[PDB]
């Protein structure tokens, strides 16, 4: 299987995307839209916009929960002053059912533009760490990525560049619990060091 790519009329490619599983859920039923995407090799992508600062991907499937339902990956590419770089960001996502719009937010899917984001689970159904949150919490549309890699605005040689993972040696919660524990371990080894030196007398009178 290969990626859905969007090549430009000018002699350079543009934004490309990959997953293993791609499942979208509506209400209770789970639909595996991964053979129609990567192995099918033909897709209806209406508007693959590019302006060198804002780009989109529309993926439409025509055979889903009832009707023709499209997914919209929305990326952006800004210049951040503090970091003096170009950082791409998956802005939100959109699913379009009967008229209605799903609006899944995806922060922590950001990257520094030259490289590519890559995550393991970009799933919905919030537990703690899921990158996709809806705008309304009792939402019906849910989606699941068992793999993930998107590059946008800086694609070269029709393939991905280095990865900017969601891997995270310390994500914030372990990095709060470590800063709490290793602070009060300085208190405990201080209280132990005073106790380890209260030595008794040698003789009595």
């Amino acid at each position: 299987m290969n990626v859905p790519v969007s090549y430009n009329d000018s002699y350079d490619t543009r934004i490309l995307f990959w997953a293993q599983n791609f499942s979208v859920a509506y209400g209770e039923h789970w639909e595996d839209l991964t053979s129609r995407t990567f192995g099918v090799q033909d897709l209806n992508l209406t508007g693959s916009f590019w302006n060198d600062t804002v780009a989109r991907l529309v993926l439409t499937y025509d055979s889903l929960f009832g009707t023709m339902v499209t997914f919209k990956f929305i990326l952006a590419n800004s210049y951040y002053s503090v970091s003096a770089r170009h950082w791409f960001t998956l802005e939100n996502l959109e699913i379009h059912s009967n008229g209605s719009v799903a609006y899944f937010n995806a922060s922590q899917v950001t990257g520094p533009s030259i490289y590519s984001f890559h995550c393991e689970h970009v799933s919905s159904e919030n537990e703690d760490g899921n990158l996709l949150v809806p705008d309304t919490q009792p939402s019906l549309w849910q989606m699941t990525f068992r793999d993930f890699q998107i590059q946008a605005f800086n694609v070269t040689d029709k393939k991905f560049s280095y990865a900017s993972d969601c891997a995270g040696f310390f994500s914030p919660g372990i990095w709060m619990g470590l800063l709490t524990s290793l602070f009060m371990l300085f208190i405990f080894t201080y209280g132990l060091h005073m106790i380890l030196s209260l030595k008794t007398m040698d003789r009595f009178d």
């Binding site: 290969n2 990626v3 790519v5 490309l16 990959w18 590519s116 890559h118 995550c119 393991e120 689970h121 760490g129 793999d147 890699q149 029709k158 393939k159 991905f160 560049s161 990865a163 993972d165 969601c166 891997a167 995270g168 040696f169 310390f170 994500s171 372990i174 470590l178």
Partner: protein, 46 residues
Amino acid sequence: TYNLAYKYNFEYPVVFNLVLWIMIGLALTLIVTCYNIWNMDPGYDS
């Protein structure tokens, strides 16, 4: 469409510190003990 990324698992913050703070917590116990026994002040005259 090559240059697919390396697939780090999603529990990478957990597994990294579950190894690290155990192993340097176990090695710190191992050096403290091994020190205490390396010299132990015997009564060696007899």
